[model samples]
Target chain A: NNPYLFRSNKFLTLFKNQHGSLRLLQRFNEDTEKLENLRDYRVLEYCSKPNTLLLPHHSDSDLLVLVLEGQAILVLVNPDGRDTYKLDQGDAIKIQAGTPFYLINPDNNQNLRILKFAITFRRPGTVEDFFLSSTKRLPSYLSAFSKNFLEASYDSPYDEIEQTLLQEEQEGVIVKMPDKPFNLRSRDPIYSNNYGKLYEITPEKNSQLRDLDILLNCLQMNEGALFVPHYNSRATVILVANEGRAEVELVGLEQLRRYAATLSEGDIIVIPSSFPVALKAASDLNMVGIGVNAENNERNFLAGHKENVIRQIPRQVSDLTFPGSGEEVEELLENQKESYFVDG
Target chain B: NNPYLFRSNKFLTLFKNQHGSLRLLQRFNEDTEKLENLRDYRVLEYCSKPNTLLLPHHSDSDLLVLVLEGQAILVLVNPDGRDTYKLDQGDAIKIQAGTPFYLINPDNNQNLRILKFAITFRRPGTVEDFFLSSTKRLPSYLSAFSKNFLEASYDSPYDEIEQTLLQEEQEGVIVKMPDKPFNLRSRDPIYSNNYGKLYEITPEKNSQLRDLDILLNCLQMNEGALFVPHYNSRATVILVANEGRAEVELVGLEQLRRYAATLSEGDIIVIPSSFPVALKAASDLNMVGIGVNAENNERNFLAGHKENVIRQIPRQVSDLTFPGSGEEVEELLENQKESYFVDG
Candidate 1:
C-alpha cells in the first residue's frame, strides 16, 4: 500500500542535465535492475522531424509516445494505401515495434514534443521475425525470382534482408553484403542485409494483450485525419480533458461520435488491431488522451538475438523496375552486379 | 492475464457507471484476477454529488483511493483518537478500517473523481469484531472521555449503563458509556450485576498511531461539500498524482505533505476506518479524484450492517451544548453526553 518506497516526490524522476536528450536513455543491465526479466525503458524527446525515411518497421519492444505539444502523424498502411493518426498535446499512443510503420510531423516547420518509450528485454526477439515467413530471400538472388515472390514493402531498406549486420574478428574489420545476383559468397564481416525472413513462425499469435482491460481509461484522440491505416499492434486510448468535448472517427469502423458524454477526464476508449481511427476536438480547446496495450513485455521488434528481415530488402529490390527519373533508374539498370558479389 | 472470461467488450461495459450520484465506472471482482496473488481493482467516475453520504462509518477492510478528478479528504480515528489523512486529484491514500473514519468532499462546489483498489483476503476480519473487542473498550474511547469526568455534567441521551445493557443485544451498538457516574439504573438497559463488563480492560496509554498518512489533492473547484460520513463495507484509497500539492492535517498526526510526483495515476491508497474527518480543498482549480471502496453489498452501512457513525452522531446530538455548532460537532457531543447523565 505504501508505494513511497523511495521518498521521491515524482513517481518518475528523470535527472538529466541540460545536455540530456532523449537519446541518452538506455536499458538497465541485469545487475542494475536486479531483475533479469525486466525490460529497460528508454526515453526519446521531441524532434522537428524524423531524420530518416525508414519504412514501416516493428520491434520486439513496445513504444510509448507522450505528446507534450504540437502534433505528430503516424502512417498505418493497409490495402487502401495509408491511414494517418494525428496526435496533439497530452495525447499518448503506444505502438508495437517491428510492425511496418512510419511517423511524420505534419508541421515540419515546428518541433513536435513527444516522449518515446523503449524497452530492453532479458530475452529479446528480432524484427525479422514479424515479417511473414514466405518473404525471405537474398537481394542478388531476388532478381532471379518471378513476380509472385515480391511482397508489398512499406519502407524496407533491403530487398533480401532486414538485418543491420556487421562482422569483426582478429582482423581490423570487414563489410559483407549480397552483390549483383543476390548472394553472400563474400566472406566479409560488417555485413548489412535487408529482406523479410519468411520462414519465421507467427509464434503466439496476438500474444500481446492488455490484462486489466477494464481498469484502463482509453480515449481515441484522432482529430484531423478522418481515416487511419492498417497496422498489426493493438492499443486502447483514453480521454483526459479539462472540458468535455471530443469527436472521434474509427476508420472502417464507425463515423464521428460525440464521445464527450462518456469521455470526461476519467473515461477510456479501446481500439483493435489492423484498423485505423481518428479523433477531433469538438470544442475550441485541446484534448488529452492515453493509449495502452495490455501486453507490457511481449513486443517482438528489438529481438537482438535473431536476424532482422527488413535489412535485406535493398539488394532484392535492385532488380525491380523503377518508376522514377531515368538517371536514378539507370543506376540500378547499368550496375551488372553479380549474385553474392562481394564489394571487393 | 485476461480479467474477463469472455472477449465481448460489452460484458464489462457498465461497471464504471455511478448509481444515482456515485460512480463506479468500471469494476471487476479482482479476487479472481489472474495477474498476482494479491490484486483487486475498481475504476470509478465522480460526476455529481449524492444527496446522502456514502459508506458511512468504518469497517474492517483496507482501501486505496486514487484521485481521477476534483479532490477529497479522508479522516480516521483509532482507539486512541489519532491517525488520519486527506487525498486529492491524482493522489492516493491508504487507511485501515475498523478504526472510525469517513470521506469528505473538501470542494465546496465541484464533484470529485476517484479510483479505488484493495487486495481481498479469503477470510478477512470484520470491523465490528475489531472495535467491539470482547476484552477491551478500545484506547480511543478512553481518550474521548471528558477531561472533567468528575465535575462535568453529561445531558446526552444514552447513560453508560443503558448503553452497555443494549450493547449486548446490539452487538456493536453502544447506548451508554463507562465514564458516567455510578447509579442504580432505572429505565436504562444496564444491569447492576453486569456493570463491571462496561469498565473492563480499558485501552492502554498513548499507543494509538497513524500507520498510513497522506494529504489529498485539494483542487480549487470549490465543489460543494460532498460527505459520505459512512460507507457500506470495506474500502481502500489508492493515490495516483504526479506530485504532492495537497495538505492533510489530523488531530493525532502531524501535518502531512501530498506531492504529485510521489505517485502515478494508477497507484493505490488504502483507508480503513469508520471515523469521520474534515476535508478542505486547496487548489485554485478543480481537482479530480476517485474512491474505491466495497460496493453497496449486503455488508455496508446502507444495509444497517455497519454503524452510520455520521448519522449516528447527528441523531444522538440533535440537542447538545457548547463550543461548536455544525451537525458534526453536535453529534460527537451527544455521544459524550450519553456517557454522563443517563448512566451517571
Candidate 2:
C-alpha cells in the first residue's frame, strides 16, 4: 500500500531549472513492484510561475491534466484544427498522445500547479516528451532524415532551418510566455458564453486516441448554478471534487432512483457508466474527472435540445429509451439552447 | 496460429558474422499480432562453423539452446563454480541471464546449428547484449568504475586493462576458438561413458542461475538406446524432437495411467511438470526441451540410485508421492550409478 501510494515528496524530481519544477512518479526496475495497479500509468506534477509558458511539445502518452491551483490558458493543436481554452483551478483537459499542446499562466502573481495522469501507450513506466521548441531539445524524428531531404522539404537552407528550430535557450520546463494575448472571444463566437464554461477534449474519428481509451473533462459552475443533466454512453466517471460544495444527483436508469451526495474539498466520487447525473452548486464550484473505459465520453444530454446526442438520434430510438411522444420530447429538448452549465 | 508459428524462413535476421548467423522471432509492434501466445518469448536461430567461438557475453533473457546440427563445447562460469559440457546435435542447455558463457564449435568441419528459445525478463521485444569483449567496445559497467578503484582492483594500470578488454576486431558473431582444447575425459572419469554423453546445465545454490527459473539439458543417444526415467520438480517441458524416431512413456500419477507417444523429425511433445517420463530410441536420436515455468530446468531423475533426488528426500514424503517401502525405494534408487542417459 505504501508503494502504491506515492507521497508528494516520494516523486522523482525530473526537472527543476529555476523557472519552475517538474516531478514524476514512474514505475521502473524495482519500482515496478510498487506500481502493480498502475503498471501502464505515470503521474507528473508540474508547477510554474506566473507569465510562464510550457513550450510546444507532444508526449508519447495521452495526458489527463487536472489543474490543481491557479489558472492557465491551454492551446491544443492538430493538423486539421486548433482549440484554446481559458482554464481555471479545478479544470481538466485531455491531450491525446502526439498532439501538440502547450500551457501558459496568464495571471500576474498566482503560481500554476497541474497534476497530470498519463496513460503509457508504448513504453510502460515512462513518458517521452517530444519538444517542438526547446533550448536543449533532444533529437526529434525529423532529425532522422538527411539534411538534404530536410532542406528540400522546407525550401530553406540547412543553416537557416537549424537556427530557426533550435532557438530556445531556457533552462527550465517553464519559459517566457508568448508576447501577444490571445483573443479567445472571437475564436468561438457562437458557443462562447458569459457563464462559467465546460469543455470536453474528445478524440477525432480515426485518430490515435482510439487506442488510448480514456477521457477527461472540466466542469465549472457559478454560485446557485446547475449543470444540465447528461448521460455518458460509454464511460464510468471518477469525479475529483476540486473546490466549493456541490449537490450531485445520480439517476439510476433501471429503478429511476435518485442518489444524492454532497461533494467538496478534494474528495472523489464515482458515477457509473451511462448514468444520468446533474450537479448544483451553492457557491462557485470547480471540478475535474476522468472517464474510465471512454475513448471520448460519448455524451447524450437530457435537458438540451440543440446539441444533445438524444436529439440527433432517431425518434423511435429516443422514444424507446424515454417512452414519450417523439414530438413532445423533441420540443422539450429544443426549448433549451444551453447545453452546458445554466442558471438554477 | 499463423502468428505463433514462425516458419524456418520467417525469422528476422539479426546478425551475420563470418563465423555464424543469428535470426530472431520476437513479438513486437506489428509482430505482436502474430505471436499471440508467445508474447513473452523470443526465438533465436544461430549457426556457427567449426573452430569458431561466440565471444564472452551475457544476455538480458534466459536462453534455452537446442542443438539442431553438429556439436559444440559450452563453458558457463560464476563466482561459485564453473561448468563445461560437450553438446551434440539434439542436445539442449539453459544459460541464465547475466551468466558469462561462451560456445565453441570444437569440430574441424561440421557446422553448428542451434535454436534458442529465450524468455524476456526485462524489456519486451528486445534483448540487451552486454558484450565483455568487442572491437568497438561500448563502455562496459566495469569501465564506469574510477580509474583508481579499477587499478587497485586489477592490480594493473587502467590502460593495460582497457587494451586487454577491447581486443576484438572481427566482423562476425563467432571468433577464433581458444588455442587449447578442454579436457573432457577426467572431469568425471568413472561416469563418463564412451557410448554417448549427457549434461544438464543447472544452477548451484548460490549462483547466477538462481536468478533464472528455467532448466535445460543435452541428450545424445545411439540406436537401441534408452534414456532413464526422470521428472522435473518445478517445470513443464516442451520437448522438441530434433531427429530420428523415439518412443516416449509418461507415468500419470493421478489417474494411474500410462501415456505413450512416438516422436520423430522436428516433432514437439510436452512432458507435464513432475510426471515421471522416459524415452527409447530406435536410431541415433537427439532431442531438446525447455521448462515452461523455469529459467533453468529443475530436473529430478528417478533412474539413478546415487544421484536421484528421491534418495535424498525424507522416507515418509517419498512414500507419499510414490508409496512403497521407503527403504526398498532408497535401495533401488541407490543401485544405479549413472545420473543421465543411462542404458536400459
Candidate 3:
C-alpha cells in the first residue's frame, strides 16, 4: 500500500490564538515524500473563529487559498491600491508572493476554514511569512526600518510612528475583526480589473515564476449564469462544485469527443490545460477547487460577451486568420464583452 | 548522482532477423526504472532494415512513435479504410488503442529507427501485440478464424485463404516491403483527415484511457512556415528539434510573459499543458518529441483557417461567441480550409 495516500492529523501548528489557528504540513514528513512532485509545495490549513482576522502578512512563495467552509473577507494590498474579495465556502483566491494580504472571518456563528497550497518559488521547500502588523519580536515594519529611513519616508516623528504602529494588540496571528461585514463588490473598479482580478505574485531572489503552476479559483455564478469558455495555457484545472450545482462541457480536440456532465455538491471535474471549457450554475453555484500549475496562469477566452485575448491580434493578421471576413470577422471575435464571469 | 540518469545499451531484443531488430526496455531494467514516469509507461526502440516491413499488427497500449532516423511509411488500417503516412527522420505519430497498423523502411540506403513511448493503460505494465500475419506461435488470422468461419466469410476455399494469408517472408517481425515509394497523400479524404494523421495502438484487457495520456507529433515545416497557434488541453509536451532549426513562442497566460526561443539540432523545450504555442521553422525544420497524456488530446485553435473543433458549436451559440459580426465571423472561422498543417 502506498503510505502517502492517506491523510493524517499530525500537522504542525504554525500559529495559535484564542480566535484561530494556522497549521501546516511539516517538512520531511512521510506524507511529504509521498507527494514527490510536491516536494516544492507547502500545504497549510487555517481556521478562524467568528469575527476573527488574520493580520496583514506576505509570504516568500505564491499561495492558492481554498475556502473549505464558512465565509470570509480577504484584503489584498497592492502598490496602486488594494482589492477586497468576499469569499464564501468553496471560493478560492490566489495570493501572489510578496503581496500583503489579510483574511477575516465574517460569520457570527461559524468558523472560517481555508486550505492553502503554497508553491515555493524562491527556494524549494522554503517559506517565510513576514507579518507587517505589531509583534513583540520586530515591532511591525516600523522599528524594522531605520529611524532615519522612517523619518525620511514619513512626515511624522519616528517615535510617534513607532508607537502607533506598535499599538495594536499583540494577539499573535489571529485576532477578532471589527464587528461588521464589508461588501467586496462595492470596491472601486480601479483596484479591480476584469478577468477575475488577475495578479502577479512576484517572488524573491531565486524566485522566478514560470508557467502558471498552482492556484485556486473560487468562482461564483448566479443561477443560470455561465463561466465563460476559456482555456488555461499552462495548468490542468481540477474543479469541485463546493456549493450548489454546475454543468460542464468539454470537447476533446483530437477525437472530437464531447464530454458533458452536471455536478452536484462535492462533484469534481478535471479540465485539461488548453481545452475550451464552459460551465453553468445549476442554481447560484459556488465553485472552489485546487489547480496544478495554475499560479500566474494565463487564460485564452474564446466564447464570452467581451473582447478576448485573441482580440489583441493585429487586425491584418486576424483578417488573414479567416480570410475575406477581415473586419467582419474582427467584429465577431470582439463579440464577447464580459471578461471572466458572464450571465446566461 | 542519479544512477538512472545515464543511458544504457542493455535492451531486450524482441525480434532479430536479417532485416532488422526490435528492442524494448525489459521490465525492472535500470533504464525502465530510470524513467520515473515509466511506472506508468513502457519504452521501446525499433530498428528496420532498408525496404523492410513490419507486418500488420496491433497492441493494447496507446503508442507515441518517434522517428530517430531514416525514412519510413506507416499504414494505419481503419474500419473505413487505411490511411498512409510518409515519414522521415524526426517525424513522430500517435497510434491509439486497437488501431491496426504496419510500418516499413522505404529508404534503400538507410535503416529506419524509431523510439516508442507505450502508455500502460489497461493492465499496468502489461503489453501484448497481436499480429494478423503468420508466425511460429500463431497461425494467420484466417486459420485462427476456423474453417467454417472462413468459408462463410470469404468466397475462396478456406484452405486457399489460409495458405494465402500465412504465406509471408516471415524471417521475423521485420520483412522487406514490395519495392517502390507510394504516394501517401493520395488516400481518400473520407478515410483520412488533415492535421497529421493520428492513430491509437490500443492495449489489452483491464486497460482504460484517461486524461488524453501519451502521444507524439513529429512535424516538419518548410523554411519560414508557421505552425499556427494551438494549445494542448491534456498533456505537457516536451519538444525536441531533431533536425534543422526552429523557433517556438509560448504565451504565459498568468504573467502574460512570453517564452520564446530558437532551437538548434538536439535542443529541447518544454511546453506546459494549455499554453498557446506556435512554432516556425528556421529553415526546413523537423521536430520529434514525446508527450504526457496526448491520446485523444484536445486542441483549441484560435487562428487556423480550417474548421476547428469550435466549428462544432452551434451557429447560434457560436455566433454569440463573436457577437457583432455573425455571418462575417462565421465566414472568418470557415476560412481555414486546412485541418492540421497550415500555410505560412
Candidate 4:
C-alpha cells in the first residue's frame, strides 16, 4: 500500500452541523510506520455554508489556513486588540498554536471552504482545538471558572456569568452569522505570469508561518503547462487537488523508486522532502493547494521523530545482548514484529 | 546533588529591562536522569517594576502564573473580546499555552513579582514565546509578512504597516504603560482563615487549567499551622517559597527515601507524585505557591516519558543473545553508563 496517498473518502468528519462539516485525516504514522516522518502533522478541511460563523477557538498545533472557495472574514485575537481580515479564495493565513481565531462565511450565496495544515507539536499527529464559545456538544473553556472567579474576572455578577456560559437551545459550532460585512481584503494577484499563477506564502512572506517554519501555496495552472519536476530543499508537502484532475509523478529522494498517483478533486498526497514531483494538469484550469510541514518545524525532545535510544546503543551492548544471534537480533530490531509472542 | 532542588541563584536570565527581569530554571531532565519525571516543566519568574507593561505574547507551554507580591493587571485575548483580570498577592491564573496575554504593574511605588510554572508539551524540557510586539532584540511575528500580505491584512499601504511594525524607538519588552486605572479582580478570600488560606485552582475550579490537567495553589500559613505529610494520588508539585521561611520533608514514592530542604523566600523545590511531603513554616505569615504537573499533562506520543523499547524485548530473544553474561548485561541495561567507549 502507498503510505503517503490519502484517498478523498478517507477523511473522517470531526464536526458537523447544518452549516457545514469539518473533516480531518489520520496522522500519517497512525496509518503506517513507513510515514513516521509525517506523524507530526494533520490536515483539517473546514467547509462552511453562506452566512455561517465558525466560533472562536485555538489549536494545540501551529497551522496554515488556505482559502479554497468564497469569501470570509478571519479575525485573530491579540492580547489587547484583534485584527480582522477579509479573505478571499487563494488567501492563506498562518496562526500559531494556542492563538485564538474565528472565521465568518460572509458571502450571501456561496459557501466558504478552507483547508488547513496543522503541525502537531504537543502530541504527534494530534491537534486539539479549544473553543471559546460553547455548544450542545462542547462546553466553553470559560465554563471551568468558579462563580467567584467569573465574578472577579468578568467584573460581573455570578448570575450574568452563568447566563452567558450556560449552553441551552444552542446550535452547533457552525452557527448563522448576522448579516454583516467586513472591510474588504484580498490575497489575490499572484506574482506569477501566464505560464501559471503560483501564489505561495512562506516565512519570508508571513512571520506567523515562521513559528512553525512552514509554507503554504496554491496554484492555478493551464492544461498544457503543468508543474515541472521539482523538489523542496528541506521540506515535506501535502498537496490537495482543490478543483482539478491531475496525474502526479514522484521519485524517492533516497531509494530512487518512482510512485505515481492520479488525483481528482479533493484527493491528497504527501511528498517528503527532496522527492522530485512532476504534475500533469488534466483539466483546462486546474487548481491545487499545498502545505509544507518540515523538519525545522521542531520539537521531539528525548525520543520519537528521531533520536532512537535503542538504536543509539553501543555496539558492544548489542553484541552482548544477542551473543551469537546478534545479526538475527539486529534484523528483528530493524523490522517490526512488535509483539512478545513471536511465531516459533 | 539533588535534581529536584534548584538553589536560590540557579535561575538564568531570559530577558531583562530597566523595569525588571525574567529568570527561568533549567528543565528537570536537563540536569540528571534521577529527575526525568520532572523533565516536561520549567519555572519562570517574572519581576516587573511599578508602572511597567509586559508586551503581549503567547507561550508554547501551558502555564500557571501566581502573584508573589504587589498587584497587576493581566489581559487575556479572545477572538471576539478580551478578559482583563486583576491579580493580587497569592492569586493564581492559568493560561493555556499559545493564548496571547499581557501584564501591567499599575502600582507606581511597589514592584510586581510573579512566578509561573510552564509545562512543555510541544518540546520536552523546552518552551518558547512568540511576541506580537517588536523590539531591538526581537522582531514582531507580523514582520514575516510581505508587503502585499501586510497591505491586504491591514487594509493599509505597506508604508503604514512598516511604520507600525518596524521597531525603532522601542524601550525593551517591559515598557512604560500610560497612567491608567484598571478594574481590580482579586483571587483571595479563601475559605480557610485561622490556620491557613490554601487557595487552589484545579480543572474543576477553572476550565483553562484543565488543558494541562494541572492545579495551582498558594498558601498563607501561621507558624504553628503547617502541611502534614500527605501524598497525591497522581500529581507532582513544584513549590516556591514566596515569603518568610519553611522546611520541607519528602519521602520518595518508589524508593521511600526521605529528602529534606529548608527554604527561604524565592527558593524552589519539586515534589513528585505519591511523595509524602510535610511542610513546617519557620515564620508566621509564610506564603508558598505550588504548581501541579502530572502524567495526564500528556504527550511523548511514541517514546520517552514512558515505554522502554529495548527493555520490552522478548525473553527468548534476550536469552539467546546474552548467552553467558545475561545477568551482567541485564544489570548494565538497567543501569546508566551511556557511552560508546566503555571502560573496557
Q: Rate the local accuracy (lDDT) of all candidates.
A: 0.29, 0.60, 0.59, 0.63
Q: With candidate 4 superimposed using the best TM-score fit, by how many Å does residue A94's alpha carbon deviate from the native?
A: 2.2
List of clashing residue pairs for candidate 4? A98-B98, A144-B207, A207-B144, A322-B321
Q: Between 2 and 4, whose TM-score is larger? A: 4
Misplaced by over 4 Å in model 2 are A1-39, A42-109, A121-196, A205-216, A235-240, A251-259, A269-273, A288-297, A308-338, B1-39, B42-108, B112-344
The sequence of per-residue lDDT tens digits that candidate 4 reaches over residues A1-344 is 46778887889898998899899987777767767877677888999999987766556566777788888888765333456788877667667554556788989999999888886544346667765444666665445443433343333455654553433324567777651121112355343445466555555545565556666666666665555555666667777888867778877744567789888888888877766677777774445445455434321111121222344556667778656455655555566332211111
Candidate 3, position A98, lDDT:
96
Chain B TM-score of every predicted model: 0.31, 0.51, 0.51, 0.72
DockQ for every model, please: 0.01, 0.01, 0.02, 0.01
Report the candidate with higher DockQ, 2 versus 3.
3
Relative to the true interface, what fraction of contacts does candidate 2 keep? 0.00
Binned by DockQ into CAPRI classes (incorrect, acceptable, medium, high), candidate 2 is incorrect
Candidate 2 structure quality by residue, lDDT tens digits, B200-252: 44444224334554445445677665665555533556566667877776654
TM-score, first chain, each model: 0.31, 0.53, 0.53, 0.73
- Cα lDDT of candidate 1 equals 0.29
| lDDT (C-alpha) at residue A32 in model 4 | 77
Q: What value does the TM-score of chain B take for model 4?
A: 0.72
lDDT by residue (tens digit), candidate 3, A1-344 = 22222122445778887899997765533443323334566677789999998988999998877678989889989899998888876555667899999999989999888877687879888888988887543457656778788888887887787777756657587877671121222233221223233222211111222333444445666676666555554455556565688767663322223466777764556565545566767687766545565443455554333434444433433332222233653555344455555544
* Model 3 residue B78 CA deviation in Å: 14
Per-model TM against the reference: 0.23, 0.34, 0.41, 0.46
Candidate 1's C-alpha runs over 4 A off are A1-46, A49-55, A77-82, A117-344, B1-344
Q: Return whichever of 1 and 2 wins on lDDT.
A: 2
